[PDB]
Amino acid sequence: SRPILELKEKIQPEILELIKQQRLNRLVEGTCFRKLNARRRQDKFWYCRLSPNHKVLHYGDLEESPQGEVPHDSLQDKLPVADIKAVVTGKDCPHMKEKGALKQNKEVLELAFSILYDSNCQLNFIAPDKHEYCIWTDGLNALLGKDMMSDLTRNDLDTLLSMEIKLRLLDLENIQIPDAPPPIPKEPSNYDFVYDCN
Amino acid sequence: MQAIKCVVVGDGAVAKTCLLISYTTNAFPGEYIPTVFDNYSANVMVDGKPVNLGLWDTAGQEDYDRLRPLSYPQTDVFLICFSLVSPASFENVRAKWYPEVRHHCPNTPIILVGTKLDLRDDKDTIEKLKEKKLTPITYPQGLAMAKEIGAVKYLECSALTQRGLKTVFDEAIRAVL
Amino acid sequence: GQGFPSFLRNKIFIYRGKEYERREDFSLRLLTQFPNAEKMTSTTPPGEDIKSSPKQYMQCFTVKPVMSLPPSYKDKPVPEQILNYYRANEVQQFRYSRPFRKGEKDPDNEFATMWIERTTYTTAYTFPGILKWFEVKQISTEEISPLENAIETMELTNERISNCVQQHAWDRSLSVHPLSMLLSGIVDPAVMGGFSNYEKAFFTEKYLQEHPEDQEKVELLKRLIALQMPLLTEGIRIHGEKLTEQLKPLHERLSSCFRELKEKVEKHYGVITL
């Protein structure tokens, strides 16, 4: 399967961009995200919707909505996409290093993600669990245009790439691929096609 | 329909009046028009209902310490101000402005505000401060002074960009609200 | 820009914003409406390259809704409500002020350079209309001398003081804080003294050499402040009606400086009060 694997991984990008646009759709549809220390009558749930233009983010201190996102002008409909330095995930979050009343417990160690903007403002947000946490990080790096950080994303990569290559090997059934490519027959330099074109 | 009293002090070397008038004028950055009078006002909606307000433009000369406190009584909030790029302004605030203000009105929410945020990281301004042996003093120590007073908020804004400026005024209004 | 659709490219529009939309709130709301959400900084003049260049460029700024003429109202003592309605509604003209330095940048003084290129806008249809916006139909500029600058600043000052005078003269359960606002700001141009600025800039004989023939305006300013002064008198007495013990030091300072400026205009300015 050496030529098989080479050909398989070598036609990569289509699956990757499909995954990324799916992440884009997921960010736009979004959900009600989780705040920090929403205990004393604070809305833990609040939606963060990406623009269909994927350039502004509709988010803010929205209410405890179990239905999820409500389409409207969120408390802030803009997140400057063009200037986000990064999102800190894990211990890099300054809110995690808090030792006062905003102490995030070690149980949100993988729900800590803070959008970097204004060089001093951060958005220390919490995800309900791991898979969507990785999903949102993936969506952000898709806005960032770099690699993904969802295990499920690598899952999708391998599985769909395998499906596609598997559905191509139908022509080559009962046939073998010389690992060394077959020698190219010498094409006569004349292009005077005896038969007409098209 | 209601109005809010709001005082602003500070040394005259920072020209906070420029900031205030630029905000109220809704003007383009670097496009404000200097008036002949002080104590500007505006009517602003922050939440639910629009509210009136007025900003006591108080001159920061040491001598007018006789007239300035007479304006203090029954002011809903006060805004202490400084220059982020003037260590001398820091010395005045921590040494003169903050002490005497907290003395005068110990019972009122306070917000500290930076200035010349663009000039904070202005490399030429920074190198001028260094060669003049002054410090382009940054946020975390401003946050330290905010903790020092426990001000309800501290923010840094700029006039040439009006960045956070709207946020500055909104935080000021919602300090009461 | 050029990426704009045909009817949008290189076109100027005026938008009847909400009751209290800040310039940048509306700006961002429009950014929602558009990709390539950028702003040039040369707010007043156009950009020739971007008259033809792609990459749509935008700019937002409040303009002044030029006061309409309520017909047959020009002189009757009609109450304010009518006019404040007419103040912003049923309007077509829009001016936009323009700062400019024209003169020496003397340190203590800004008015030695102050010239304003107010830009007037006339649209096709009068707000409000079927659409919450409209293109400009004709655009024009203005030019304002520091003489004029002083003139109209003084004017708007006077009518504002009037405005507060009658609004608090009609309503009783009314905040005294605006009275504090005004009376303070006018009484002490504390950060910088506008009156002495007028004196140094215009009342000086040096201006009468720079503009000898254009002395017919310093007399106008003298008349302006002279008409101001009794309005200041009614402001003082209105405060006395609204005076409180906290305002009492305030009120005495106001009143003392008020007669101070009284005699200053009467004799030091040598201007004749009515």
UniProtKB/Swiss-Prot annotation, chain A:
Entry PTM: Phosphorylated by HCK.
User: What is annotated about its quaternary structure and interactions?
Assistant: Interacts with ADGRB1. Interacts directly with the SH3-domain of DOCK1 via its SH3-binding site. Part of a complex with DOCK1 and RAC1. Part of a complex with DOCK1 and CRK isoform CRK-II. Interacts with PLEKHG6. Interacts with HCK (via SH3 domain). Interacts with ADGRB3. Interacts with DOCK5.
Please tell me in which tissues this protein is expressed.
Answer: Widely expressed, with a higher expression in the spleen and placenta.
According to its UniProt entry, what is the function of this protein? Involved in cytoskeletal rearrangements required for phagocytosis of apoptotic cells and cell motility. Acts in association with DOCK1 and CRK. Was initially proposed to be required in complex with DOCK1 to activate Rac Rho small GTPases. May enhance the guanine nucleotide exchange factor (GEF) activity of DOCK1.
Which residues of the full-length protein are shown here?
Answer: 530 to 727 of 727
- Name of the featured protein: Engulfment and cell motility protein 1
Q: Which residues form the PH domain?
A: 26-147
In which compartments does the protein localize? Answer: Cytoplasm; Cell membrane
PTM-bearing positions, type Phosphotyrosine: Y191
Place the motif SH3-binding on the sequence: 178-185
Curated annotation (Swiss-Prot), chain B:
Q: In which tissues is it expressed?
A: Isoform B is predominantly identified in skin and epithelial tissues from the intestinal tract. Its expression is elevated in colorectal tumors at various stages of neoplastic progression, as compared to their respective adjacent tissues.
For the modification Phosphoserine, which residues carry it? Answer: S71
Positions of glycan attachment: Y32, T35
- Binding residues annotated for GTP, in chain numbering: 12-18, 31-32, 34-35, 59-60, 116, 118-119, 158-160
TM ranges are: none
What is the recorded phenotype of mutating P73L?
In MRD48; decreased substrate adhesion-dependent cell spreading; weak dominant-negative effect
Which E.C. number(s) belong to this protein? 3.6.5.2
Q: What is the effect of changing L67A?
A: Strongly reduced interaction with PLCB2
Name the consequence of V51M. Answer: In MRD48; decreased substrate adhesion-dependent cell spreading; weak dominant-negative effect
This protein's source sits in the domain of life called Eukaryota
Substituting C18Y results in: In MRD48; decreased substrate adhesion-dependent cell spreading; dominant-negative effect; reduced neuronal proliferation
List (Microbial infection) O-AMP-threonine occurrences by residue. T35
Q: Where is this cross-link: Glycyl lysine isopeptide (Lys-Gly) (interchain with G-Cter in ubiquitin)?
A: K147, K166
What are the entry keywords?
Cell membrane, Cell projection, Cytoplasm, Disease variant, Glycoprotein, GTP-binding, Hydrolase, Intellectual disability, Isopeptide bond, Lipoprotein, Membrane, Methylation, Nucleotide-binding, Nucleus, Palmitate, Phosphoprotein, Prenylation, Synapse, Ubl conjugation
- Gene Ontology CC annotation, any one: plasma membrane
How does the protein associate with the membrane?
Answer: Lipid-anchor
* Cell location: Cell membrane; Melanosome; Cytoplasm; Cell projection, Lamellipodium
Q: Which GO terms describe its biological process?
A: actin cytoskeleton organization; actin filament organization; actin filament polymerization; anatomical structure arrangement; anatomical structure morphogenesis; angiotensin-activated signaling pathway involved in heart process; auditory receptor cell morphogenesis; cell adhesion
PANTHER family, sorted: RHO FAMILY GTPASE (PTHR24072)
Protein name stated in the entry: Ras-related C3 botulinum toxin substrate 1
Taxonomic source organism: Homo sapiens
From Swiss-Prot, chain C:
Point out the coiled-coil segments of this chain.
none
Give the subcellular location.
Cytoplasm; Cell membrane; Cell projection, Podosome
Tree of life domain: Eukaryota
DOCKER domain boundaries = 1-274
Say which family it is in. Answer: Belongs to the DOCK family.
Q: What's written under domain?
A: The DOCKER domain may mediate some GEF activity.
Give the protein's function: Guanine nucleotide exchange factor (GEF) for Rho and Rac. GEF proteins activate small GTPases by exchanging bound GDP for free GTP. Along with DOCK1, mediates CRK/CRKL regulation of epithelial and endothelial cell spreading and migration on type IV collagen.
What does the record note on quaternary structure?
Interacts with CRK and CRKL. Interacts (via N-terminus) with tensin TNS3 (via N-terminus); the interaction increases DOCK5 guanine nucleotide exchange activity towards Rac. Interacts with ELMO1.
Q: What is this protein called?
A: Dedicator of cytokinesis protein 5
Q: Which residues of the full protein are shown?
A: 1369 to 1642 of 1870
